[PDB]
Design a protein around this ligand. Structure first.
Ligand SMILES: OC[C@H]1O[C@H](O[C@H]2[C@H](O)[C@@H](O)[C@@H](O)O[C@@H]2CO)[C@H](O)[C@@H](O)[C@@H]1O
Length: 404
């Protein structure tokens, strides 16, 4: 009978790939359907380039793809419209914001699978050791805490210890980090939902200059090459006071044999001042059935299973990744394992999207301009002032003649 082949999450990021392969294999066993799992590279933009090869070929060799929240406008032609397969009641069990994200020109490109938001990880033991009673609310406070804690830990003999790790590699994750910096300084959304390219302003320039000021100081020089896992591994070994990352790192840090089990908490990222907006970049993944699948019925059944309450529950409990079903945020077991899902739910609700809606199918080009200009600041090659000016010019060229 058919073999349903899934290009799923990466085994190179935490447990996400191993876990998803397990869920796909469980579906195959429950239904008596043969399955195969196709692994992916860690970085989202590398995944996009890989899947674009299959889509260009109209390849039947993948039935289901796990797609980024930033991709529906890019990937829609390659998606089977799921709308005819779900009832209105079924579709209302997911967050409407994500269903809307996934719907392009009325086509439901994909089912919401897990959501994501950038958050601040902090070492509670170290804050207490150095006389701090709360995590930092402003970036200045973050820098002050990091300077003091680093000085003390270095003096105590940990030469591997840093104050802050984050994603500074030139790839999509830096666009995500940089949206948080810029928005939390009151510098806007880079490209606003209305189409205005707003990034050439002094608050956005300051945000980028501030992040440059971290590199080689409170953050490793090598942060300019870090994606999610590089930052996590410094943090997880016990060697960073603070980390900016996504929800998946929490469960990994709590695993038996983690050096930092029981030593950390999470909160909203800091901001420039009390009246700036809180910033958490909206991430997350969706489940798409290929327009090129020879087995759409079976593929749809697998995607519904993966997006189901029980599978999302397992993702939450075991991998600390955020459900797309509001009902799971009140589930007793989800909450007992991850009480911060409740504490941070307003952060998740107010997360700021990258400019994928407005850029549509040109989003990857826009994002490449963003991360490259941002990276030039982090390396000390350009000042923020010049970079936001250059970035404006680039995005103007990229989006010229694009309408949304
Ligand atoms: O790097 C930007 C990318 O980060 C997040 O995606 C991660 C996800 O958190 C992990 O659990 C795992 O699935 O790997 C993904 C790719 O590194 C965001 O979800 C995504 O929106 C964002 O583009």
């Amino acid at each position: 009978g058919p073999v349903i082949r899934v290009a799923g999450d990466s085994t190179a990021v935490g447990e996400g790939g191993r876990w998803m392969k397990e869920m796909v294999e469980a579906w195959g066993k429950k239904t008596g359907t043969r399955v195969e799992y196709i692994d992916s590279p860690a970085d989202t933009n590398d995944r996009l380039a890989l899947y674009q090869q299959y889509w260009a070929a109209r390849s039947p060799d993948v039935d289901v793809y796990m797609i980024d929240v930033i991709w529906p406008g890019i990937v829609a032609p390659h998606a089977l419209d799921l709308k005819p397969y779900l009832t209105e009641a079924e579709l209302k069990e997911f967050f409407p914001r994500i269903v809307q994200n996934n719907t392009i020109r009325g086509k439901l490109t994909s089912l919401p699978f897990f959501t994501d938001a950038g958050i601040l990880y902090y070492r509670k033991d170290l804050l207490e050791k150095y006389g701090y009673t709360s995590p930092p609310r402003t970036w200045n406070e973050l820098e002050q805490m990091a300077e003091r804690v680093m000085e003390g830990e270095r003096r105590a003999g940990n030469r591997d210890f840093w104050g802050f790790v984050f994603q500074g590699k030139p790839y999509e994750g830096l666009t995500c980090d940089a949206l948080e910096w810029i928005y939390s300084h009151g510098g806007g959304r880079i490209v606003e939902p209305d189409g205005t390219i707003s990034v050439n302003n002094g608050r956005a320039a300051l945000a980028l200059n501030r992040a440059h000021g971290w590199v080689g100081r409170i953050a490793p020089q090598g942060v300019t090459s870090y994606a999610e896992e590089e930052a996590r591994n410094v943090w997880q070994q016990g060697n960073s006071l603070f980390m900016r990352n996504w929800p998946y790192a929490y469960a990994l840090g709590q695993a038996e044999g983690s050096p930092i089990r029981g030593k950390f908490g999470v909160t909203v990222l800091p901001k420039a001042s009390a009246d700036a907006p809180n910033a958490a970049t909206l991430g997350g993944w969706q489940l798409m059935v290929s327009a090129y699948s020879r087995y759409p019925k079976e593929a749809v059944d697998l995607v519904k299973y993966l997006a189901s309450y029980e599978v999302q529950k397992d993702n939450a409990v075991r991998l600390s990744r955020l459900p797309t079903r509001p009902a799971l945020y009140t589930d007793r077991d989800v909450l007992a394992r991850n009480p911060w899902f409740r504490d941070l739910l307003p952060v998740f609700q107010n997360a700021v999207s990258a400019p994928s809606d407005v850029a549509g199918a040109r989003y990857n080009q826009v994002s490449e301009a963003i991360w490259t200009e941002v990276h030039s600041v982090l390396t000390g090659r350009k000042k923020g002032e010049q970079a936001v000016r250059d970035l404006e010019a680039r995005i103007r060229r990229i989006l010229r003649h694009h309408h949304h």
